């Protein structure tokens, strides 16, 4: 519902009672029309429909004028992937998503494909822009259809764009003067958009100061904090939801039940196959479909929860176990039907060892929920089945004692092969 606000906050849009409200203390009027989907996780969806809009009327009844030259805008956003057959429109058609104009002066936020654009228009109408563009040729993108944090700061000399707390862009704007900023704010997709186009946003805020990088980084962490884990897209991780599994230490690797052994072999993700020169990605919807079950008033997965990691093997739900007696530093996990046996552990404690914001989680096998003894962490290990030839190997879905010490190190090793993320089907990702 916000992060850090040291008297510089002048607009603070937050969810309240199936509505959005300005909690800044300036009492702006907010009108959410019917085409806007809201939820109590403070996310709102702008669509292509005419009634999908928000009008914020800022408070003109106050004597105090809060913004002169210095001001900042912050929000989280989730931008759906290009449609593979619609790359040309994606690349060329720019659309406004937030517009604040009064007397041919103000600001706007717009999107053109994989680019998000901040535009300033001073009181004379003179215009400057700054943008952040993310790669659409990554095997695995940090940005495409995943929640990320934008902060835009403005002073006399510079317009800056921070992404997830880090400075990414900077435009000199000495040649424009101040912008008249008290106008209506219209959240609405405006441009030559596909009928299918949409955008999700969250925690929209305006500040009457230029936020320091220090401040933005703090706000990033505070607004990232949750007691629950997240999936790959950054939404709350859920029980009873079908998920593909991603490994942050092995981005292009996915798990498949071996055809003649009750173990999970690791294979390489297939990639974009249709020869457009503008795009590349690795496929996400592959490997076994996993599902998380509660071991036991909502379906949200929280840190330190005890779980069963299951997956679907044709039309049966199977389970991931560890054989109780393994002497080696790591061992292949046992994938089999749901079953009780005193020769196998089946209880996993889901973990979050990283102290910085992340969508990765870790999976800890323990004897019993009760015991303090730690068996190992689920991760990928390598097996040289011929000679030790570094380029000829077989990777496997394993439990590992080695990761137990490795997760202790600070700062957290983001790239450990015991870092997992869960990917549900999402309408913002087609392949």
């Amino acid at each position, epitope marked *: 519902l916000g992060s850090e606000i040291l008297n510089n906050i002048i607009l603070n849009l937050r969810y309240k009672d199936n509505n959005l409200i300005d909690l800044s203390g300036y009492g702006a009027k907010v009108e959410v029309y019917d085409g806007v989907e809201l939820n109590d996780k403070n996310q709102f969806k702008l669509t292509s429909s005419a009634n999908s809009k928000i009008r914020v009327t800022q408070n003109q009844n106050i004597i105090f004028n809060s913004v002169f030259l210095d001001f900042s805008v912050s929000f989280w956003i989730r931008i759906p992937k290009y449609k593979n057959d619609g790359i040309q429109n994606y690349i060329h058609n720019e659309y406004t998503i937030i517009n604040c104009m009064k007397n041919n002066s103000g600001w706007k936020i717009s999107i053109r494909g994989n680019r998000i654009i901040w535009t300033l228009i001073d009181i004379n109408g003179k215009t400057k822009s700054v943008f952040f563009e993310y790669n659409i040729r990554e095997d695995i993108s940090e940005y495409i259809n995943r929640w990320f944090f934008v902060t835009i700061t403005n002073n006399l000399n510079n317009a800056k764009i921070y992404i997830n707390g880090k400075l990414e862009s900077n435009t000199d704007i000495k040649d424009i003067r101040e912008v008249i900023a008290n106008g209506e704010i219209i959240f609405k997709l405006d441009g030559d958009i596909d009928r299918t186009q949409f955008i999700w946003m969250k925690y929209f805020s305006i500040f009457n100061t230029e936020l320091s990088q220090s401040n933005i980084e703090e706000r990033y962490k505070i607004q990232s904090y949750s007691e629950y884990l997240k999936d790959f897209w950054g939404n709350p991780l859920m029980y009873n939801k079908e998920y593909y599994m991603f490994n942050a230490g*092995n981005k292009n690797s996915y798990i498949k039940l071996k055809k003649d052994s009750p173990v999970g072999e690791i294979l390489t993700r297939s990639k974009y196959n249709q020869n457009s020169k503008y795009i590349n990605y690795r496929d996400l919807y592959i490997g076994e479909k996993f599902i998380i079950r509660r071991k036991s008033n909502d379906d949200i997965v929280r840190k330190e929860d005890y779980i069963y990691l299951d997956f679907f093997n044709l039309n049966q739900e199977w389970r991931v176990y560890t054989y109780k007696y393994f002497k080696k530093e790591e061992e292949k996990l046992f994938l089999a039907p749901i079953s009780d046996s005193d020769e196998f552990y089946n209880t996993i404690q889901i973990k979050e060892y990283d102290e910085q914001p992340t969508y990765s989680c870790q999976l800890l096998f323990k004897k019993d929920e009760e015991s303090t003894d730690e068996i190992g962490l689920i991760g990928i*290990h390598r097996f040289y089945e011929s000679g*030790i*030839v*570094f*380029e000829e190997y077989k990777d496997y879905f394993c439990i*590992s004692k080695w990761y137990l010490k490795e997760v202790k*190190r600070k700062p957290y*090793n983001l*790239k450990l092969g015991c870092n997992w993320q869960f990917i549900p089907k999402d309408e913002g990702w087609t392949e």
Partner: nanobody
Amino acid sequence: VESGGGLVQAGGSLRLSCAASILTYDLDYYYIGWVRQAPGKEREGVSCISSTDGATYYADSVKGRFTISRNNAKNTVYLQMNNLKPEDTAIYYCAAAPLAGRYCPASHEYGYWGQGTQVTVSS
């Protein structure tokens, strides 16, 4: 940047070094490894060492002949190659990768590469 390469009679010795303060400016935890490529062949991982605890790994093809080490203070990495054979002839690259698992990175998993140093073994 690698150095130390050159022409060596069989089976003599050679010590490669790499200033690996580059290749590692992005990584808090990493493997530094040596990958070589012979003129008609695919890249061949030969050895690596972890920034973590100095664990070392070797390909069977160089076992008992190669030793990898690290100065730490100068952040320099060394490869001692003993009893070289003509099969060892190649360009040798020093590379760095994230510390993902308890095993040496495959050649495609290395993220930052030096320019390589030529090593030739004759007879």
